[PDB]
Design a protein around this ligand. Sequence first.
Ligand SMILES: Nc1cc(-c2ccc3occc3c2)cc(N)n1
Ligand SMILES: [Cl-]
Ligand SMILES: [Cl-]
Length: 330
Amino acid sequence: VKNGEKWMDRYEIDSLIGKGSFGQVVKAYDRVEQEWVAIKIIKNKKAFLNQAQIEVRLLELMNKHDTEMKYYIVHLKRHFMFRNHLCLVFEMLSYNLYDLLRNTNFRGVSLNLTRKFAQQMCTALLFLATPELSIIHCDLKPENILLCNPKRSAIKIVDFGSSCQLGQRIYQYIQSRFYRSPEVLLGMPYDLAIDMWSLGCILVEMHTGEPLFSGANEVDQMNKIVEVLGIPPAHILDQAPKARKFFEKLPDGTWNLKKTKDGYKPPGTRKLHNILGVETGGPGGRRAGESGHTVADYLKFKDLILRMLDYDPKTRIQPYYALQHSFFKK
Ligand SMILES: Nc1cc(-c2ccc3occc3c2)cc(N)n1
Ligand SMILES: [Cl-]
Ligand SMILES: [Cl-]
């Protein structure tokens, strides 16, 4: 698009912030408001235009709800069509939580900073669950959570490009694989609980520095989930279109892993207890003796994460109840 380019006697393009599947995000000066903005420029192809039109509708739907809880979502200032590209104008934010992890050399941030991110993200999910909204983000991951300010720990969620209201589902294959819920891996109709699953994955990663479940493909993904959480419950597998991609039903109505050639730990034996280092000074023992990282602080964190990683989307913890958990009590 080129630095120095002027649009509509209003925006002056400075530089490329980021590239997406959708098109590109540029830094631009708005002469009317007298402020810098992020312009998300959608590719001039029907597929990307039509999905971005849904993104604009969902962001405008959120903006018309003035509540405390709306201010953890990136603000869409406005949108327009230019040279046959849909253009979404956002507030400027800072760098993403993946960059934050990269900057720790993938050793993770403190339990105290993790808690601050968790509380903001739980508040965002509570907003999206407002009945009149019922928005599923569908692509929650560190790259999609941005700091408001490089000096501060305020965050906002970005990228509602995959997002849908409950009962407006388009695609069965959604979420980034590391953050994909068992219900999506199993080809089941999904609801807002898929974001809470992603969040559990994100919070463990923010503290250990490494993805909790880094599958190379869906079969590897489900195997890595099973290593930590065991075989999913029969009542879920009995209703799952894709259960037999991963599991086999026994004579007695019981399920087991499909095994391929080895060259995984037995189901439920890679304990989150050990991944977090609850009784061993935190991830890789690197938090030994630091304040805010006692066994008791760890056990509360472990408890909240295991509720976020319930296999059953029905009983998985919901945003309001996550905000009341002891992990967030002084
Ligand atoms: N909705 C949305 C927003 C952004 C966005 C908004 C403001 C920003 O400031 C700095 C980077 C950035 C990205 C990116 C995408 N892919 N989707
Ligand atoms: Cl990642
Ligand atoms: Cl997606």
